[PDB]
Ligand binder design. Structure first.
Ligand code: TTP
Ligand code: MG
Ligand code: MG
Length: 280
């Protein structure tokens, strides 16, 4: 019946279909024609809907997916954790968005979220993902991402509409070596920390990690802070005030004074690191 849905017929015009399978907390896209993992940039890693349907039964994947590209007219709106046990809307921001963006709406594969597919253009001043105290979240994309396709039409909104999307500025938040290269470096050296366990002195885990950051970041405390905030050791205590500074700032400053040598990107003195790798 999926091809009966007018919105699915609209998506089936494009050979931008994939299949996906649940891997722990994630949904990995796969090439429907050979079962290999699919890039979101390689068009020949995708197929048309017929090939996606066949690959779905062949590899026993969880469902269909559609890769969004710049040239196609579709915008993908991801609403997470906005539904009831009854698959009923419980978040007021999601209820207001649905009142102002009436287009194809389907229930996401976890049963507690929603997808809205619209024809239009995203405002250029909004974040891709917005998280709310609620625990729900709003995620919007028009290219460089795939979306799962369920066909579970919500409220009979089964047609992709052409709508203005300037209204999304009322829901999403606004926005105006490198860190990622350093993070990958520390991971390959095994200097990236695990999440703390039961009975772990978190504060000394912070200090050990801060000492490693001082070396690999060249004692650039701003970069040390940006990288720490993306680590499994980040918590609210990092920004709690303490003696006219923050706990995180005092930790990073003590690491900068404690640590002797530094990693020089031009000298590649990875062997000068004084700390053994984290065990596994
Ligand atoms: C590469 C990749 C893409 N995606 C894509 C596919 C998702 O449809 C889309 C939105 O992320 P999610 O909201 O986490 O997944 P979902 O909306 O399809 O299902 P639900 O929210 O009900 O659990 O991001 C992943 O989720 N994980 C990945 O690893
Ligand atoms: Mg979702
Ligand atoms: Mg697009």
């Amino acid at each position: 019946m999926i091809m009966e849905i007018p919105a699915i017929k609209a998506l089936s015009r494009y050979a931008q279909w994939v299949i996906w399978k649940k891997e722990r907390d994630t949904k990995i896209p796969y090439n429907p024609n050979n079962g290999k993992k699919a890039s979101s940039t390689d068009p020949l890693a995708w197929g048309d809907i017929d090939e996606a349907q066949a690959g779905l039964v062949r590899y026993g994947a969880n469902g269909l997916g559609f890769v969004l590209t710049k040239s196609d007219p579709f915008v993908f709106i991801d609403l997470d954790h906005v539904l009831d046990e009854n698959k009923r809307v419980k978040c007021e921001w999601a209820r207001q968005l649905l009142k102002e963006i009436k287009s194809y709406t389907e229930i996401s594969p976890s049963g507690d979220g929603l997808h809205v597919v619209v024809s239009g253009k995203l405002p250029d001043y909004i974040k891709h993902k917005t998280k709310f105290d609620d625990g729900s979240a709003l995620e919007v994309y028009e290219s460089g991402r795939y979306m799962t396709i369920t066909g579970e039409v919500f409220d009979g909104r089964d047609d992709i509409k052409e709508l203005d999307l300037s209204i999304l500025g009322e829901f999403a938040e606004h926005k105006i070596l490198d860190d990622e290269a350093i993070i990958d470096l520390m991971k390959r050296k095994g200097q990236w920390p695990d999440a703390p366990k039961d009975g772990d002195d978190w504060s000394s885990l912070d200090m050990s990690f801060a000492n490693r950051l001082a070396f690999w970041c060249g004692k650039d405390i701003e970069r040390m802070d940006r990288i720490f905030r993306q680590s499994p050791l980040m918590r609210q205590k990092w920004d709690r005030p303490t003696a006219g500074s923050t706990y995180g700032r005092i930790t990073l400053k003590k690491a900068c004074d404690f640590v002797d040598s530094v990693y020089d990107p031009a000298l590649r003195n990875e062997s000068d690191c004084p700390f053994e790798p984290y065990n596994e």
